[PDB]
Structure 1
Amino acid sequence: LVPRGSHMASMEIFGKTFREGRFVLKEKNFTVEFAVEKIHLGWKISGRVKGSPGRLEVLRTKAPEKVLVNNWQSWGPCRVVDAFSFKPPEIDPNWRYTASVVPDVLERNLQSDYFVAEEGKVYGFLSSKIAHPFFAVEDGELVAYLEYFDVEFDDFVPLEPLVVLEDPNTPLLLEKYAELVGMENNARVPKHTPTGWCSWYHYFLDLTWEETLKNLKLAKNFPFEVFQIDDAYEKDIGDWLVTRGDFPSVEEMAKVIAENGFIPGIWTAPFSVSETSDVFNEHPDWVVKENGEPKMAYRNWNKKIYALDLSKDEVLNWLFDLFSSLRKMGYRYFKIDFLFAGAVPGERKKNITPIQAFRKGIETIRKAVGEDSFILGCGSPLLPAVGCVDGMRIGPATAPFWGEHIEDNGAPAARWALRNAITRYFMHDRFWLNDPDCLILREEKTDLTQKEKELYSYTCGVLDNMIIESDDLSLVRDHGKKVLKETLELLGGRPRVQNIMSEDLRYEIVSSGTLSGNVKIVVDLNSREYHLEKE
């Protein structure tokens, strides 16, 4: 049944003592109508709100000491922290909005987006369609909020539902939470998971068409379905159909890839336009603003990057035409990246939330590419994308190195990429297909050891995650090939991370019903060791 106790009586829901029922809260500026209803292993708080709810407090309870917190987007940590020893992070002004969509919170208080967990307990919002749902630890209390970013609603709109789940099996609760999210959002969980190649983690921005063609030819000896060109081909951020260097046209690239027998894939950052791009210089009015001027969304590639205003029909028509063109060229796999830009707070043509704008953008992309195109989100708000993407990057960038000296701050490192694949495992086959980022299996031009390559690869396999390789294929020999083969034999199961609240970077992961039967891998991300059991 449902959690009952002294701790449940101590909570407040919209400022009211917690109990089951149906309630109305009329304030100066807003009205909320909500129900507190029993569900399996928990309570669901749902309802509707009108007026100017602003930063709306939904739930308040005493903070646990140890909490699993979650960043709103792909690259940000999902990790256990000590809620009482928390000190605000230094916020990088070039990357504010990767850290938080409400950075005023993160500068003062511990923040968790969408959900937070403790041993035996999960608090989780089922959707982010209009509001941004988050938790803050405020002077020793856990507070759940729905952020409406100053938008007013003349008529009722639905609250994002909040569940409070209790059971000693914390992994089970996170899986249940994720099943509910999936149902709430009509999640896409493809029956088939693509394999493939990605340029980025060998060539980076220095990819050439000449190196691409060499890899296209070698890829015929590898079990790759998709062949994906990453960042490098494009003249500027926003100018997706203008190529640079020795690259032919985007259309020509797709024709060569498909002639060679692969599904063509391509990277874009579709909600981003650089200060130097044609599209921005032609259409300065297409971006999110602040005090009526272009608002920097982030800085990357040594340029100010602006966010497209996805409330504008002109912008949506441009995006539709871009992605429709890509589809007509033969691209059927789309890595759409830096998606957080589309949800930055600021001034938009329409008075809608940044989450409402974001969802209009990704829905447009989905309509343009069609149902038989695979969409892989990256650098993306997680909950708002459920129902639209097929796959989602759920960790920071991996790297051809373990990252001994790299802090847990979203900078590239195999070690922190893999941690997130583990701690967000429960989203897989519920929200979408989890992308744990690319396997790096080459045995030159890398500092990864054989054991580190095995650890990363076999973990991803056990988790049933997407398996994409990113290497100069000339440099992948017997070991690399064997690791890929054995990885693919570990797919197909239902994984569980048995000790999700671990604080020592050691994880016990089982998966039932894989192509190799019931398997278990125990990993130590500090010593870089694993123990794998099969059958």
Structure 2
Amino acid sequence: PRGSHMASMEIFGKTFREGRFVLKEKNFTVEFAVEKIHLGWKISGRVKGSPGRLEVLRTKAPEKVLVNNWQSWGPCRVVDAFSFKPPEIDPNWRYTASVVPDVLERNLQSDYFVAEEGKVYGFLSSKIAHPFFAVEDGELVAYLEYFDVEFDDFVPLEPLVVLEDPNTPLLLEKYAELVGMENNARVPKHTPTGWCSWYHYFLDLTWEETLKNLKLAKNFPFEVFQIDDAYEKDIGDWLVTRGDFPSVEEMAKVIAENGFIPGIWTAPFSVSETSDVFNEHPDWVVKENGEPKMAYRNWNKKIYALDLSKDEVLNWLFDLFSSLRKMGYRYFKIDFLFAGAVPGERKKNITPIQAFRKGIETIRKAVGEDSFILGCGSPLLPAVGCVDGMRIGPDTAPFWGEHIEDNGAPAARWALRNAITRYFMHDRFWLNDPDCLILREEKTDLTQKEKELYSYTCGVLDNMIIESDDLSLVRDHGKKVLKETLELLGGRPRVQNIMSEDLRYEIVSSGTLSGNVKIVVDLNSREYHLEKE
């Protein structure tokens, strides 16, 4: 703490300094150590009792901070911390904005990490507690939320690092490297390419349209062929199809007979009020005052959350994913995962994050080591070590999104921003999924230069490349964009000006299949400049 900033910091309520410490409080006990590491400090240890909302760190808030939403779809972006006014939270989607919405509606909240020019504060895990930062009355305060759970014996704290260097991107990358080691992150050596139905057909996908695309896909460089939301009769009833679809097993065997890795979408922690599964098993869901607690509203229905502390539920999940694996599915887009982590009443007195982790661990076991798991709508930190790929932005769209605010509604411009601002997770936490390329020439408002901007940025960043189009509408230009994109993969990217507030970014990537590359993108002008070799 030779630094004046550092002498002014507090750790578990005491003046910051190196050492080993014990805080014995009325309702809890924490034993911690503050240790020097490369680039900064690590705070680790263990806690027992009822820590509640546990204060770990306090320092004066910086004027400008990079803040991160806990899940795939929420923003990672630079915000002015003094002029901040809280958002109104949509009561149908409360918990996507925050697992602690009493914070979000009052104070600036950042989940897992927060950054300023030259300094990263970041928790290395979220296995038990939800780690977050709030700006309370001009102070940056780091908390570990234990959701009123009580611990008879010590459990480990989520470690906190405080890193300092003028190269902020390097700091973020080092932070993410430490996260990956703390959580035995899965970084596959091979990244799948593929097709996804969603961004052309949406809920109106038919099997007949699917079959046309399946035939056409033989002319495109796609390993995986993934059916999205559309095939299922209700949310929760994943093995009952509707409309013109065959059985879930039959789809897999057609897809495999055409030579693709079959993939499929589920929302596995979600059951609708109308679903067979909820109607058969009403005590399978998280509760509020003893009754089903609405987790979110979507598909014009109340959607409940499976209670992943229940063995009956985890057995059902195991059987479901085991069946899909038996059928031939080897790629799983597992969506709306925030549902499994909603606060409320569960059968076991465990945190929502502990519950969440037992559900995704079950799914991993059931599908096996040779299946690819793509997370979506998901808490980020709790999933490291389990998923192979992760959606890290809000949904893209077949339009740029000129009148779409940065509020989570679909838009190419906001999906692409998050692929930039979360670049440092890629090849550290998992493979980043920037959401699908949309390269068709009809049934879209995107220009050729917008499609290029999106696609080439994704390539430079080495992110997963999945296309979502009616392939009969993809012509020479789309095929050219896809081919050139795939040539930009394979490098080690860096967003050199991660703290930019004007949506212009300079991005380098060393050692791509096209050598050292650089792309300057402007999300406001919708322009890029790319240099190769």
Question: By how many angstroms is 1:309 displaced?
Answer: 0.1
Secondary structure of residue in 1 paired with 2:144: strand
Aligned counterpart for 2:353 among listed residues 352, 355, 365: 355
Moved over 3 A (4+): none
Deviations 1:87-122 (A, max 9, x none): 000100000000000000001100000000000000
Deviations 1:412-454 (A, max 9, x none): 0000000000000000000000000000000000000000000
Counterpart Cα distance in 2 of 1:101 and 1:151: 15
Counterpart Cα distance in 2 of 1:242 and 1:415: 36
Counterpart Cα distance in 2 of 1:149 and 1:42: 30
Question: By how many angstroms is 1:344 displaced?
Answer: 0.1
Counterpart Cα distance in 1 of 2:234 and 2:500: 42
Counterpart Cα distance in 1 of 2:265 and 2:307: 20
Deviations 1:147-183 (A, max 9, x none): 0000000000000000000000000000000000000
Counterpart Cα distance in 2 of 1:262 and 1:431: 27
Counterpart Cα distance in 1 of 2:526 and 2:468: 21
Question: By how many angstroms is 1:76 displaced?
Answer: 0.1
Counterpart Cα distance in 1 of 2:442 and 2:493: 32
Question: By how many angstroms is 1:133 displaced?
Answer: 0.1
Counterpart Cα distance in 2 of 1:296 and 1:487: 41
Counterpart Cα distance in 2 of 1:107 and 1:233: 37
Deviations 1:62-105 (A, max 9, x none): 00000000000000000000000000001000000000000000
Secondary structure of residue in 1 paired with 2:321: helix
Secondary structure of residue in 2 paired with 1:92: coil
Counterpart Cα distance in 2 of 1:25 and 1:429: 37
Secondary structure of residue in 2 paired with 1:357: helix
Question: By how many angstroms is 1:401 displaced?
Answer: 0.2
Counterpart Cα distance in 2 of 1:272 and 1:65: 39
Question: By how many angstroms is 1:360 displaced?
Answer: 0.1
Q: What residue number does 2:222 align with? A: 224
Q: What residue number does 1:408 align with? A: 406
Secondary structure of residue in 2 paired with 1:491: coil
Give the TM-score, by structure 2 length. Answer: 1.00
2:515 is the counterpart of 1:517: yes
Question: By how many angstroms is 1:488 displaced?
Answer: 0.0
2:81 is the counterpart of 1:59: no
Counterpart Cα distance in 1 of 2:324 and 2:524: 43
Aligned counterpart for 2:272 among listed residues 270, 274, 280: 274
Counterpart Cα distance in 1 of 2:45 and 2:405: 41
Q: What residue number does 1:295 align with? A: 293
Deviations 1:21-73 (A, max 9, x none): 00000000000000000000000000000000000000000000000000000
Q: What residue number does 2:305 align with? A: 307
Counterpart Cα distance in 1 of 2:90 and 2:197: 28
Counterpart Cα distance in 2 of 1:295 and 1:83: 33
Counterpart Cα distance in 2 of 1:108 and 1:235: 40
Q: What residue number does 2:36 align with? A: 38
Residues 92-491 of structure 1: pairs in structure 2 closer than 5 A: 92-491=90-489
Secondary structure of residue in 2 paired with 1:499: coil
Counterpart Cα distance in 1 of 2:108 and 2:4: 25
2:124 is the counterpart of 1:90: no
Question: By how many angstroms is 1:4 displaced?
Answer: 3.8
Give the TM-score, by structure 1 length. Answer: 0.99
RMSD: 0.4
Question: By how many angstroms is 1:350 displaced?
Answer: 0.1
Secondary structure of residue in 2 paired with 1:235: strand
Q: 1:290 to 1:115 in 2, by over 3 A?
A: same
Question: By how many angstroms is 1:496 displaced?
Answer: 0.1
Secondary structure of residue in 1 paired with 2:234: coil
Secondary structure of residue in 2 paired with 1:242: strand
Q: 1:252 to 1:4 in 2, by over 3 A?
A: farther
Question: By how many angstroms is 1:372 displaced?
Answer: 0.2
Deviations 1:226-281 (A, max 9, x none): 00000000000000000000000000000000000000000000000000000000
Question: By how many angstroms is 1:534 displaced?
Answer: 0.3
Deviations 1:341-400 (A, max 9, x none): 000000000000000000000000000000000000000000000000000000000000
Question: By how many angstroms is 1:193 displaced?
Answer: 0.2
Secondary structure of residue in 2 paired with 1:105: helix
Counterpart Cα distance in 2 of 1:300 and 1:118: 36
Counterpart Cα distance in 1 of 2:268 and 2:38: 40
Secondary structure of residue in 2 paired with 1:380: coil
Counterpart Cα distance in 2 of 1:230 and 1:192: 22
Question: By how many angstroms is 1:316 displaced?
Answer: 0.1
Counterpart Cα distance in 2 of 1:528 and 1:139: 38
Counterpart Cα distance in 2 of 1:45 and 1:4: 18
Counterpart Cα distance in 2 of 1:525 and 1:5: 37
Counterpart Cα distance in 2 of 1:289 and 1:377: 25
Q: What residue number does 2:506 align with? A: 508
Across the two proteins, how many residue pairs are aligned to each other?
A: 533
In structure 1, list runs of 5 or more residues that go unmatched. none
Question: By how many angstroms is 1:469 displaced?
Answer: 0.1
Secondary structure of residue in 2 paired with 1:227: strand
Counterpart Cα distance in 2 of 1:249 and 1:288: 30
Counterpart Cα distance in 1 of 2:400 and 2:298: 23
In structure 2, list runs of 5 or more residues that go unmatched. none
Question: By how many angstroms is 1:519 displaced?
Answer: 0.2
Counterpart Cα distance in 1 of 2:169 and 2:187: 20
Counterpart Cα distance in 2 of 1:518 and 1:411: 35
Counterpart Cα distance in 1 of 2:263 and 2:81: 42
Deviations 1:257-316 (A, max 9, x none): 000000000000000000000000000000000000000000000000000000000000
Counterpart Cα distance in 1 of 2:450 and 2:93: 30
Secondary structure of residue in 2 paired with 1:241: strand
Counterpart Cα distance in 2 of 1:411 and 1:55: 31
Deviations 1:489-523 (A, max 9, x none): 00000000000000000000000000000000000
Counterpart Cα distance in 2 of 1:89 and 1:453: 32
